[PDB]
Design an enzyme around this catalytic site. Sequence first.
Site, PDB file in Angstrom:
ATOM      1  N   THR B  40     -32.531  56.304 -64.964  1.00 55.62           N
ATOM      2  CA  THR B  40     -33.272  57.262 -65.775  1.00 55.62           C
ATOM      3  C   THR B  40     -34.720  57.110 -65.350  1.00 55.62           C
ATOM      4  O   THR B  40     -35.519  57.845 -65.929  1.00 55.62           O
ATOM      5  CB  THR B  40     -33.082  57.092 -67.338  1.00 55.62           C
ATOM      6  OG1 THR B  40     -34.002  55.934 -67.492  1.00 55.62           O
ATOM      7  CG2 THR B  40     -31.684  56.826 -67.849  1.00 55.62           C
ATOM      8  N   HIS B  45     -36.722  48.248 -67.050  1.00 58.74           N
ATOM      9  CA  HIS B  45     -37.908  47.841 -67.848  1.00 58.74           C
ATOM     10  C   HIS B  45     -37.449  46.703 -68.739  1.00 58.74           C
ATOM     11  O   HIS B  45     -36.248  46.352 -68.751  1.00 58.74           O
ATOM     12  CB  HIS B  45     -38.632  48.945 -68.624  1.00 58.74           C
ATOM     13  CG  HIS B  45     -37.775  49.764 -69.525  1.00 58.74           C
ATOM     14  ND1 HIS B  45     -37.238  49.341 -70.733  1.00 58.74           N
ATOM     15  CD2 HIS B  45     -37.284  51.025 -69.349  1.00 58.74           C
ATOM     16  CE1 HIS B  45     -36.483  50.317 -71.222  1.00 58.74           C
ATOM     17  NE2 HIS B  45     -36.478  51.339 -70.403  1.00 58.74           N
ATOM     18  N   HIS B  48     -34.115  46.663 -70.837  1.00 58.38           N
ATOM     19  CA  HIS B  48     -32.921  46.260 -70.179  1.00 58.38           C
ATOM     20  C   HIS B  48     -32.709  44.767 -70.032  1.00 58.38           C
ATOM     21  O   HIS B  48     -31.534  44.414 -69.729  1.00 58.38           O
ATOM     22  CB  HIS B  48     -32.880  46.844 -68.732  1.00 58.38           C
ATOM     23  CG  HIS B  48     -33.143  48.310 -68.647  1.00 58.38           C
ATOM     24  ND1 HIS B  48     -32.157  49.284 -68.787  1.00 58.38           N
ATOM     25  CD2 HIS B  48     -34.288  48.982 -68.403  1.00 58.38           C
ATOM     26  CE1 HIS B  48     -32.720  50.478 -68.627  1.00 58.38           C
ATOM     27  NE2 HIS B  48     -34.008  50.330 -68.409  1.00 58.38           N
ATOM     28  N   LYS B  82     -30.986  58.428 -78.366  1.00 54.42           N
ATOM     29  CA  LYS B  82     -31.882  59.527 -77.989  1.00 54.42           C
ATOM     30  C   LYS B  82     -31.786  60.588 -79.083  1.00 54.42           C
ATOM     31  O   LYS B  82     -30.688  60.982 -79.536  1.00 54.42           O
ATOM     32  CB  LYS B  82     -31.534  59.984 -76.581  1.00 54.42           C
ATOM     33  CG  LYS B  82     -31.591  58.820 -75.594  1.00 54.42           C
ATOM     34  CD  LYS B  82     -31.401  59.163 -74.144  1.00 54.42           C
ATOM     35  CE  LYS B  82     -30.967  57.991 -73.257  1.00 54.42           C
ATOM     36  NZ  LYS B  82     -31.156  58.445 -71.847  1.00 54.42           N
ATOM     37  N   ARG B  86     -31.820  65.484 -73.093  1.00 50.69           N
ATOM     38  CA  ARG B  86     -32.618  65.035 -71.949  1.00 50.69           C
ATOM     39  C   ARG B  86     -32.469  66.038 -70.819  1.00 50.69           C
ATOM     40  O   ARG B  86     -31.492  66.813 -70.843  1.00 50.69           O
ATOM     41  CB  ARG B  86     -32.152  63.640 -71.485  1.00 50.69           C
ATOM     42  CG  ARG B  86     -32.655  62.461 -72.292  1.00 50.69           C
ATOM     43  CD  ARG B  86     -34.149  62.447 -72.477  1.00 50.69           C
ATOM     44  NE  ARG B  86     -34.590  61.448 -73.337  1.00 50.69           N
ATOM     45  CZ  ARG B  86     -34.994  60.543 -74.123  1.00 50.69           C
ATOM     46  NH1 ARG B  86     -36.305  60.294 -74.319  1.00 50.69           N
ATOM     47  NH2 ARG B  86     -34.182  59.734 -74.791  1.00 50.69           N
ATOM     48  N   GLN B 173     -17.958  57.164 -69.460  1.00 52.43           N
ATOM     49  CA  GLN B 173     -18.122  55.724 -69.717  1.00 52.43           C
ATOM     50  C   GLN B 173     -16.726  55.209 -70.160  1.00 52.43           C
ATOM     51  O   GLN B 173     -16.244  54.142 -69.751  1.00 52.43           O
ATOM     52  CB  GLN B 173     -19.121  55.439 -70.764  1.00 52.43           C
ATOM     53  CG  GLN B 173     -19.500  54.009 -71.058  1.00 52.43           C
ATOM     54  CD  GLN B 173     -20.794  53.722 -71.733  1.00 52.43           C
ATOM     55  OE1 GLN B 173     -21.791  54.410 -71.993  1.00 52.43           O
ATOM     56  NE2 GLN B 173     -20.904  52.432 -72.152  1.00 52.43           N
ATOM     57  N   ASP B 194     -26.827  50.623 -79.333  1.00 52.20           N
ATOM     58  CA  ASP B 194     -26.557  52.036 -79.248  1.00 52.20           C
ATOM     59  C   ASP B 194     -25.304  52.413 -78.475  1.00 52.20           C
ATOM     60  O   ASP B 194     -24.936  53.619 -78.505  1.00 52.20           O
ATOM     61  CB  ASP B 194     -27.791  52.779 -78.671  1.00 52.20           C
ATOM     62  CG  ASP B 194     -28.108  52.427 -77.256  1.00 52.20           C
ATOM     63  OD1 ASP B 194     -27.290  51.794 -76.568  1.00 52.20           O
ATOM     64  OD2 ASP B 194     -29.197  52.780 -76.759  1.00 52.20           O
ATOM     65  N   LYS B 228     -42.129  49.615 -82.242  1.00 53.73           N
ATOM     66  CA  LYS B 228     -41.150  49.665 -81.144  1.00 53.73           C
ATOM     67  C   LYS B 228     -41.326  48.580 -80.089  1.00 53.73           C
ATOM     68  O   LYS B 228     -42.348  48.555 -79.352  1.00 53.73           O
ATOM     69  CB  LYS B 228     -41.291  51.077 -80.548  1.00 53.73           C
ATOM     70  CG  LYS B 228     -40.069  51.485 -79.985  1.00 53.73           C
ATOM     71  N   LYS B 231     -43.145  48.925 -76.651  1.00 51.53           N
ATOM     72  CA  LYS B 231     -44.068  50.055 -76.778  1.00 51.53           C
ATOM     73  C   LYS B 231     -45.518  49.570 -76.776  1.00 51.53           C
ATOM     74  O   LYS B 231     -46.085  49.285 -77.850  1.00 51.53           O
ATOM     75  CB  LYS B 231     -43.756  50.871 -78.020  1.00 51.53           C
ATOM     76  N   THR B 232     -46.060  49.515 -75.574  1.00 52.45           N
ATOM     77  CA  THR B 232     -47.454  49.095 -75.341  1.00 52.45           C
ATOM     78  C   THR B 232     -48.387  50.282 -75.242  1.00 52.45           C
ATOM     79  O   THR B 232     -47.976  51.454 -75.081  1.00 52.45           O
ATOM     80  CB  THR B 232     -47.476  48.180 -74.056  1.00 52.45           C
ATOM     81  OG1 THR B 232     -46.472  47.148 -74.401  1.00 52.45           O
ATOM     82  CG2 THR B 232     -48.829  47.628 -73.661  1.00 52.45           C
TER      83      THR B 232
HETATM   84  N1  LIG Z   1     -24.553  53.959 -71.491  1.00 52.29           N
HETATM   85  C1  LIG Z   1     -25.440  53.032 -70.760  1.00 52.29           C
HETATM   86  C2  LIG Z   1     -25.112  53.042 -69.268  1.00 52.29           C
HETATM   87  C3  LIG Z   1     -23.691  52.984 -68.810  1.00 52.29           C
HETATM   88  C4  LIG Z   1     -23.180  53.803 -67.797  1.00 52.29           C
HETATM   89  C5  LIG Z   1     -21.850  53.719 -67.397  1.00 52.29           C
HETATM   90  C6  LIG Z   1     -21.000  52.790 -67.984  1.00 52.29           C
HETATM   91  O1  LIG Z   1     -19.692  52.675 -67.621  1.00 52.29           O
HETATM   92  C7  LIG Z   1     -21.484  51.947 -68.979  1.00 52.29           C
HETATM   93  C8  LIG Z   1     -22.823  52.075 -69.393  1.00 52.29           C
HETATM   94  C9  LIG Z   1     -26.880  53.502 -70.993  1.00 52.29           C
HETATM   95  O2  LIG Z   1     -27.071  54.713 -71.157  1.00 52.29           O
HETATM   96  O3  LIG Z   1     -27.795  52.655 -70.984  1.00 52.29           O
END
Ligand SMILES: N[C@@H](Cc1ccc(O)cc1)C(=O)O
Lengths: 317, 317
Positions: B40, B45, B48, B82, B86, B173, B194, B228, B231-232
Amino acid sequence: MDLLAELQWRGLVNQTTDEDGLRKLLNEERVTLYCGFDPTADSLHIGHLAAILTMRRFQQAGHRPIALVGGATGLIGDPSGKKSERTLNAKETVEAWSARIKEQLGRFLDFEADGNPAKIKNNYDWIGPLDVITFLRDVGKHFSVNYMMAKESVQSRIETGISFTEFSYMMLQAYDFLRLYETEGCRLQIGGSDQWGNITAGLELIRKTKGRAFGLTIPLVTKADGTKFGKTESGTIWLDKEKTSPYEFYQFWINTDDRDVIRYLKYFTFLSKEEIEALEQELREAPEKRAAQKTLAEEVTKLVHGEEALRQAIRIS
Amino acid sequence: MDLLAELQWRGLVNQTTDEDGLRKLLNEERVTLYCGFDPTADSLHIGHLAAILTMRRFQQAGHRPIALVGGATGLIGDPSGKKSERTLNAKETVEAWSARIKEQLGRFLDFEADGNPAKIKNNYDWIGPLDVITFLRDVGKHFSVNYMMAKESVQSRIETGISFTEFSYMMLQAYDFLRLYETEGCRLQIGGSDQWGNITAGLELIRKTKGRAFGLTIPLVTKADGTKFGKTESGTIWLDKEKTSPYEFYQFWINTDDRDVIRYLKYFTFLSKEEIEALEQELREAPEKRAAQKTLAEEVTKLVHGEEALRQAIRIS
Ligand SMILES: N[C@@H](Cc1ccc(O)cc1)C(=O)O
Ligand SMILES: N[C@@H](Cc1ccc(O)cc1)C(=O)O
């Protein structure tokens, strides 16, 4: 104009996206229109005839018809007009069944005409090779789940239950209209009553990708007794003469109730208004004669099976 | 057992599908687990990091980690966490960004270990070549729209609005977990807070296709001030040293509020309980010293950038 007014007179117009707009276009140009048919069996049935013959009528008035065989969509299944989730048939089955349907389809349309000969097409050709990523972004970005949940086909099923498979069906059909619009100049899509949602979804996709096309639905064929048209004790009245013989086909029609016969002559026949009116008066004045009933049976059996088939049916009776 | 109890102690367990079951398995076998990361941006960052280092911890306790790069899903977009739809990034962008992320990912895991070396994988490899028909039938048949509408990610958006694109993300997923389960013996999927819905959707797909796997989510990193995390005023704290220099990375951590520092040492560091407790007492007895704060900054900067990078940061400060 007159085509549309005749359809109306006959009772073949349930709904239309914009009647003045469509009338206008029909009157100014040769319109490319299409109708979709999914292999859900190895033969079409009288459930498909109204849609089929309406195509024919558009052809006779100088328009260009495309009959779409659902090779791809027949692999997903349309929830429209179905109260229950359907079983997935195998590629092999669908593939085989498509071949047959293409065959029955060809009987009702003109391929020799110059200017407006028909085309028979299989949506597997463009859905077959489409990757999921492309589909979710190129088609899917255009639709909100809220737009789709509201659709009669789906609304009718979320408590009842509906897989994502069938919920997605409308996108696929949506996509067919866009492809046909682009590659064949197709501006009108027609279908039975239950197809309104799928049709308008194709219009939403066109609108949203191009920013010009219309939709027409034929009404559900009614019975005065309130039973299911085509629902015989025998089981379905197929268009395949090896499933439902010409004699049986012929008897089905001959047994039309006095109450239904005039609606059926208007729907399934190429008799004029004036011939149809005349039979109405004869139906009134001499109803034991069964003139409207034999006229129906001969006309429709000839259409579907031809004269020799008709000749047999009558002599067998 | 102890791994799971330590995680718990640290506060890295928000939810688990079946804790006794998972504890049991962790204790009896080398578990293959995976975590997904979608491009993305052209860098990961500190958003993660918790997920990343938790993987690491599973590796250290003798388990096998697979870090999944979202080449396919990064092309659809996860609505989870979100509030708004997006924008779709281009294949070219995503493709480029995946290459980088793979690079940052590799830093935190062991590839030389024998028995439990990591794997980095790209879901484009199996989603890329999948045809829509296959996906709608093989995955889609297994899910009811009602099952999916209830998902926190989606429930949170239907009035707000959500394209079908993002609504379908969970299937994708879902499919990743099934593929990994089958080809790599993967029995545990982990993720941020999430991700619960996407994880359980993968479990629903496994259950329904096989009729054995678990899910664990890490909690959202909190701040005592209720702002957050990450969040700087500066903007995001990237893991790319060309976006956020080691000195800035280091200052971010050094500026941790007394209120947060102990939660952060537990989350992002490999310090023992006993070292962490000790710093708690030192935080109590001599808070102007900032011992917990420098310990955090050194530990995390080293992790992410290494000692020389740390050395620079300190001398630059
Ligand atoms: N859903 C996770 C990323 C993800 C992608 C594929 C997967 O199989 C698993 C997780 C995210 O948006 O941060
Ligand atoms: N929905 C139609 C068939 C169809 C298939 C594909 C289309 O593009 C259009 C229509 C039916 O189920 O009877």
